[PDB]
């Protein structure tokens, strides 16, 4: 293990609303830039840097797909771990050094609609479970897939539609990233109900740090993602499937 | 070398691994966000409004030896909720054990 000693952190006396009642984890641990960092309290991984506890200051998460599957995933601090991925990481350049942002350079249904079409930004988010883009964007792509609103931004896909849908290519650094029906839809359950969530949520973040989307565990769920402070870039490898 | 911490897995929407706060450890459950920077866990000082916290492991202070006083407050706002409290400073494991 490491021990990170003098690190600064927030004990949370109020969290109103109802978002962390039910939530299976205790508290959060952000490992963006410390430009977003609230009262620029040093993050931790910046404290590991600076106390030099890596050789190499990068993250990796692997995160498994399949709900019931053990392990659920990994977090490796200071490097990679190839039981996790095959092949080679193909990288992209952090544009704006806050969240991990970078170009985006388009969103394509199979069956011809496209996304973003001249380009955007995206930020790459293990803490949120879904992928994320703008309201009028993401109902486009529902009506291309079937789906149909659920509340607040998400939609639902009828499950014995699912294997049928088109698959959605992400283009990053010029090449293709593959999204199967499979890896974009969620099984949900509530009170012994099975139904199929859109992993896509249409939600508008507004300037100066919007418009983004944002490739949630949807996407690092397919593809195993490198964080590199070093060298202020972002990681793909296919994911072990 | 490269440390791993294995992250469990509810439902494809949350995974969350162990870490530890204090001397001893105090261990908690977290998100590994990469969309923000701070770190926080529930307070033993917690409101008594704090439903969450009635469910959730608390820090405790008094516990641990390496506890360092800060108390300025602080506020966070997500995309998913908001909560605030104060700052605190102690050393941080990761795994808890
Ligand atoms: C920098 C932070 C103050 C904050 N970051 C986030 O809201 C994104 C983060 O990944 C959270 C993590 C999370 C997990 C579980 C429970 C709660 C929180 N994910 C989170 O809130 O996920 C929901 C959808 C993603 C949208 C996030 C960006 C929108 C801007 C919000 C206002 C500025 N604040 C933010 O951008
Ligand atoms: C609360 O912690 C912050 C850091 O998160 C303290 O401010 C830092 O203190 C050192 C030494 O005074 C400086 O070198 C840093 O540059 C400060 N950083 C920032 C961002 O403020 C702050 O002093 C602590 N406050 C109390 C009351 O203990
Ligand atoms: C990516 O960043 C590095 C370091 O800042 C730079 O040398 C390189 O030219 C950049 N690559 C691209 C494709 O812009």
Known sequence: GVKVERQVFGEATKQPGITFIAAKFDGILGMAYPRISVNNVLPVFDNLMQQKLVDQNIFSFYLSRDPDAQPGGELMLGGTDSKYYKGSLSYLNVTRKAYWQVHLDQVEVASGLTLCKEGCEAIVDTGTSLMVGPVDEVRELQKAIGAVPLIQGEYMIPCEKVSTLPAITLKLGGKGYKLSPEDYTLKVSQAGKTLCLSGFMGMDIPPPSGPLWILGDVFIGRYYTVFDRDNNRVGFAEAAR | ?97
């Not at chain 2, 908690?28 to 009635?54: E, M, Q, R, Y």
């Not at chain 2, 202070?61 to 706002?77: A, E, L, P, Q």
């Open chain 2, 1 to 97: 070398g490269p440390i791993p911490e294995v992250l469990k897995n509810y439902m494809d929407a949350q995974y969350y691994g162990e870490i530890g706060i204090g001397t001893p450890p105090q261990c908690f459950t977290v998100v590994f966000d990469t969309g923000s920077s701070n770190l926080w866990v529930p307070s033993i000082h917690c409101k008594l409004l704090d439903i969450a916290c009635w469910i959730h492991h608390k820090y405790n202070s008094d516990k641990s030896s390496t506890y360092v006083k800060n108390g300025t407050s602080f506020d966070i706002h997500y995309g998913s909720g908001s909560l605030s409290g104060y700052l605190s400073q102690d050393t941080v494991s990761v795994p808890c054990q």
